[PDB]
Design a protein around this ligand. Structure first.
Ligand code: NA
Ligand code: NA
Ligand code: NA
Ligand code: NA
Lengths: 409, 204
């Protein structure tokens, strides 16, 4: 516990940019795109206000557009007088991917028509489309092969405090080890994480900070409408904060909280507000109506684990169950605890042979060991129960591909 | 129940079946078959023929049957075993785990075949496990997958009985003859014997 993330102070003018969403849509072969930026203000509206949105590729201006506020008629009462959508044509955009993370910069200016600037906001833009079609997850029209890993925010010394050095280090190692994707198990990350993933090129699964595993049964809170509100803020606030990052290609409703009606509702909310990315969720069986992707945890290759209510089928068999057509990407697989990863190649062989088996996120990146000092001040790696904590889960907090210090296993 | 149409020797295999001028003759082979056999309950699937590639004539006849007798699925393996002329993916000799990606008409591992993007049909091999001489190696593999996968609904082994013919030596003693033994040539030798039983019905 504590104030474990940055604290900051932001000054905004009274008439200001209160929100902006960036969307990139393409023609059939990706040779033309339209950049759409919906901009919302707070404060005093005046006829002389304008919004200019400009798009840059490095030092070259690709496109720019201006308009006064006042959005199209929405309904019987009209439109949003306090919003405006700028549409910019991009010919031959340089596409973003984890293979080549080409980015543009979108600059959003709020100003007067006489030309005085009120304020500017901006973001990195990666031109890329995410869509599921005919059973496959496609990125810019091509089927993804996810070489992912789950990664909690952990530092042997700082605990849950994340710094840019550590983040960079993680990313570089991941890339150096042929990973192209990361799942934010199981909560939204420190903001800079996304920025780095954008720039270095890694596909991200952004996940709501909702996990209620210790309930009995698991969906006890998630099926309870009295808890919808609390859950709702965890999902909606994430999307509102992370939706312009190209690195995020999928949203997740959380982790191990069964399957409740709250899930279905939130699933729909997101589909409705941001159609650009698929929504997944493993709870209640990994293939419920609250997920666009079959995303089991620890399902085996050829061997079924037919537990009641929430069986874990062989993933090969899972894809072809009667009526099933979705793609399958394991939210967690190959539990790397200690001397592990035996049978890892069996997943890869399956991934390569079966088109709808699109990969997975290994569990997980780094051991969650903490440093302790001995009587002589000599440091040592501690785990569950080492702080007098009880009850505890002993070494189960160490499941990573790397030691807490980043040395590889 | 399968119509009497097989044109394997053509090049490509659908040369005739894709030609409208052969549609009347194929049509009879199919419609006359349905008219005669439609009241038999043991008939649960109609088959358009065997190894005739995939031609538009097949599409037409598939549709006709469907219109005339909706009570039974129609299958046809020609052209890749999963064409628009079959209600069942019905490959011949597709392996269990191993893919055989021939161009145009690959033979996917059957488990993989089932979940190809957009595929939803059941899979029943029209032919599998070629029981030619000392064989049937790997049979259990098929069974194990048929049991584990709902949509893997079995197949028909190739085949029941050896097509060997009886001949007599000078001393009047009989022996089993195969291709060529009649001075028939060209011929395909022992290829006519692929049964689970000998011609006299003695088992292998
Ligand atoms: Na695949
Ligand atoms: Na763990
Ligand atoms: Na079966
Ligand atoms: Na034969």
């Amino acid at each position: 516990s504590g104030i474990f993330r940055d604290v900051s102070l932001l000054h905004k003018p009274t008439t200001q940019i209160s929100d902006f969403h960036v969307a990139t849509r393409f023609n059939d072969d990706f040779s033309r795109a339209v950049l759409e930026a919906e901009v919302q203000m707070c404060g005093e509206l005046r006829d002389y206000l304008r919004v200019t949105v400009s798009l840059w590729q490095g030092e070259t201006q690709v496109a720019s557009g201006t308009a006064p506020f006042g959005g199209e008629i929405i309904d019987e009462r009209g439109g949003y007088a306090d919003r405006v959508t700028l549409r910019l044509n991009v010919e031959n955009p340089k596409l973003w991917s984890a293979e080549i993370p080409n980015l543009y910069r979108a600059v959003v200016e709020l100003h007067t028509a006489d030309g005085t600037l009120i304020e500017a906001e901006a973001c990195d833009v990666g031109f890329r489309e995410v869509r599921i079609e005919n059973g496959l997850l496609l990125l810019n029209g091509k089927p993804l092969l996810i070489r992912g890993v789950n990664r909690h925010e952990h530092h042997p010394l700082h605990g849950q405090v994340m710094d840019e050095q550590t983040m960079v280090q993680d990313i570089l190692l991941m890339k150096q080890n042929n990973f192209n994707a990361v799942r934010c198990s199981h909560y939204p990350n420190h903001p800079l994480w996304y920025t780095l993933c954008d720039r270095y090129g890694l596909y991200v699964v952004d996940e709501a900070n909702i996990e209620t595993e210790g309930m009995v049964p698991m969906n006890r809170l998630t099926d309870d409408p009295r808890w919808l509100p609390a859950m709702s803020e965890r999902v909606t606030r994430m999307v509102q904060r992370d939706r312009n990052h190209p690195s995020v290609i999928i949203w997740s409703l959380g982790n191990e909280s069964g399957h409740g009606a709250n899930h279905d509702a939130l699933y729909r909310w997101i589909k409705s507000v941001d159609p650009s990315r698929p929504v997944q969720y493993e709870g209640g069986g990994a293939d419920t109506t609250a997920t666009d992707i079959i995303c089991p945890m620890y399902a085996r290759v050829d061997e079924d684990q037919p537990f009641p209510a929430v069986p874990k089928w062989s993933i090969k068999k899972w894809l072809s169950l009667p009526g099933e057509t979705r793609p399958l990407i394991l939210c967690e697989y190959a539990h790397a605890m200690g001397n592990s990863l035996g049978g890892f190649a069996k997943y890869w062989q399956a991934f390569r042979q079966y088109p709808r088996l699109q990969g997975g996120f290994v569990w997980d990146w780094v051991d969650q060991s903490l440093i302790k000092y001995d009587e002589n001040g000599n440091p040592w790696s501690a785990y569950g129960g080492d702080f007098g904590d009880t009850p505890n889960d002993r070494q189960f907090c160490m499941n990573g591909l790397v030691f807490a210090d980043r040395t590889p296993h």
